[PDB]
């Protein structure tokens, strides 16, 4: 109390100085027990891989995914993650993961990043401006480059309008750049729209190939199948715990619910649009989630002129929850002696209760 | 502080950046007040055969805390098996010498 007022003298009264909170004692992690290894390795391991104009996509699902292998790797040139960080990727579970794969040029690696511009970004592959993902790139200059110049990889140099986010254009139409109809066959101002770049092993880093495997992690609210390699623990109810339910994390008390969740609903939200109920991912039990008990802490005290004895009021806390113990509607008051004698209000407690120093502190 | 990093890694020795060098070798504090002065030392510290005197710690149990020096030479086990403190599968020296 002395510290709260930044003074060595405290006047008679009630002061709010801190907040009482029961701390969690267990970490409850529940994920679906589908331990089939997730085929992330096959997107990166792929011998082939696309071209930027037609970017291959694999939708990875129904698996347990270990991301330590990606981060611990000593080979990736660029591992830039937007919206999430690689080390903390293991903790969460994702509803869907997409693994676009393509071979870009080295100078262009910067373009395959949120809100960037260039030929690759505008007309070949555009990353959404709100991208949640990781752009994993390596110096693929020794696999995808041949002495004579590989041409299999095509980038669309000119388009009528920029490519919309996550849209694939396979069009082979001839692009007219003059008022004349070009006529659909080559000629002046008629050219194929995918211009094939040519890599040789000794080219400069600007023209060196940097393969990319953007991982577009989808965080929408729905059943989540791809998950982190974390191990699950036993479910603990009616206790303050730290929980992690299929990527949903928080601190609270888990109790049995009487809510009638429909077969497709995975979790619930309160009037505040905050999570207040969860379906356990292993047993289809519906649980209600409440915060762990908390409340303000008020110090009831006579001034430092009279006594150094104090009483503490735990606001809206029960006396069975906190560990002269007096339970009142306002909360649990400890250190004040409850008496059957009424007097005029001195230090207010709440809900009709006042305290005073008469020597000892009474309520 | 004085040390010889690789060129691509120069970006890592900047406040709040990540990579092998930043996480397990040298970490710059996120509130750094300082100057990172770097030059192209490719003609003094590189030999035709490959200088190995300069060691970077490739794998650590946890990231290096700011301005903390790790001189540990312990063998890092990457499997459930105790690797046994001698080389073998999943036992390797933790400082990998670049050339």
């Amino acid at each position, epitope marked *: 109390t002395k510290c709260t007022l930044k003074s060595f003298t405290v006047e008679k009264g009630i002061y709010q100085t801190s907040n009482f909170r029961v701390q969690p004692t267990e970490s409850i992690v529940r994920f679906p027990n589908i331990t089939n290894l997730c085929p992330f*390795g096959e997107v*990166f*391991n*792929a*011998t*082939r891989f696309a071209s930027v104009y037609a970017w291959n996509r694999k939708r990875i699902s129904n698996c347990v995914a270990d991301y330590s*292998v*990606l981060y611990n*790797s*000593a*080979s*990736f*040139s660029t591992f830039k993650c937007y919206g999430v960080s690689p080390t903390k990727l293991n903790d969460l579970c994702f509803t869907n993961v997409y693994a676009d794969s393509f071979v870009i040029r080295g100078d262009e690696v910067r373009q395959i990043a949120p809100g960037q511009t260039g030929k690759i970004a505008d007309y070949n592959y555009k990353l959404p401006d709100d991208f949640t993902g990781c752009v*994993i790139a*390596w110096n*693929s200059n*020794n*696999l995808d480059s*041949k*002495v004579g110049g*590989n041409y*299999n990889y095509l980038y669309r140099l000119f388009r009528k309008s920029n490519l919309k986010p996550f849209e694939r254009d396979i069009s082979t139409e001839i692009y007219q750049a003059g008022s004349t109809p070009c006529n659909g066959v080559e000629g002046f101002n008629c050219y194929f729209p995918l211009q094939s770049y040519g890599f040789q*092993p000794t080219n400069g880093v600007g023209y060196q190939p940097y*393969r990319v495997v953007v991982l577009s992690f989808e965080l929408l609210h729905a059943p989540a199948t791809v998950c982190g390699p974390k191990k699950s623990t036993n479910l603990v109810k009616n206790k303050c715990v730290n929980f992690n339910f299929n990527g949903l994390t928080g601190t609270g008390v888990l109790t049995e619910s009487n809510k009638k969740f429909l077969p497709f609903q995975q979790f619930g939200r309160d009037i505040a649009d905050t999570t207040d109920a969860v379906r356990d991912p292993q047993t289809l039990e519906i649980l209600d989630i409440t915060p762990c008990s908390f409340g303000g802490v008020s110090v009831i005290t006579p001034g430092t002129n009279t006594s150094n004895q104090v009483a503490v009021l735990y606001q809206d806390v029960n006396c069975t929850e906190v560990p002269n113990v007096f339970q009142t509607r306002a909360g649990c008051l400890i250190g004040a002696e409850h008496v059957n004698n009424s007097y005029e209000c001195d230090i207010p407690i709440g809900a009709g209760i006042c305290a005073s120093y008469q020597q000892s502190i009474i309520a | 502080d004085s040390f010889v990093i690789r060129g691509d890694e120069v970006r890592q020795i900047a406040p709040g950046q990540t990579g092998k060098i930043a996480d397990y070798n040298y970490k710059l504090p996120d509130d750094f007040t300082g100057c990172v002065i770097a030059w192209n030392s490719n003609n003094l510290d590189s030999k035709v*055969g*490959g200088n*190995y005197n300069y060691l970077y710690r490739l794998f650590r149990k946890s990231n290096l805390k700011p301005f903390e020096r790790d001189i540990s030479t312990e063998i890092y086990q990457a499997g459930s098996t105790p690797c046994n403190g001698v*080389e*073998g*599968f999943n036992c390797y020296f933790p400082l990998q*010498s670049y*050339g």
Partner: antibody
Amino acid sequence: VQLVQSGAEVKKPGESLKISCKGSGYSFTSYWIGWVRQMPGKGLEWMGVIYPGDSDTRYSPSFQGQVTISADKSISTAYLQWSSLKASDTAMYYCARTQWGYNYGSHFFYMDVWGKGTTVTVS
Amino acid sequence: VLTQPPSASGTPGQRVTISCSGSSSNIGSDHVYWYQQLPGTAPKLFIYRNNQRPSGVPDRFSGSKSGTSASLAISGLRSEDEADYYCAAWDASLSGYVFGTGTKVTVL
């Protein structure tokens, strides 16, 4: 995975010769069927790869333009073909199925499975 | 070009080491593959990723990298090991997988 390549050939210089490398027991259309030479009693030299799926070709510097290597994805068999047979070209020619995945960025090329070869004799 | 000693020899039950020297172009990047060619037989993957060992392979074979040189250790040598032990790696200058000069192990 039991790549059955061919028999044994004896031919005179200047003629055109074809070695088939038949694949079986796996998805032959999606793996690299690369080739390797072995002169009698010497070390293995790499020659080059062919991707049956897209007929893409790669050669070692000592062979680019000296051997023309092609593929036949319909019958699932890859072909090493000579533009002109040469005197010294006698060797024990193998065909192995290579992979070149990046294994999270660490490039590899390891010839996992090998055929029984093709002893080509020149005279 | 990977350089290897022309022969190795030792008593069965011993441990034999084989060197394979190279530059920074070839062995500078995760490449120390090992295949043996027993007389009349085709090589097959026996060591990958410097030391990793395929399922189907005797456990006594372990090798490792020494800078820009490779090293293979056959612990508890046995009779059948008369196999031309090849260290491989692909140069990266004009690409191209290169096999070492090959080592013919004689058991004594």
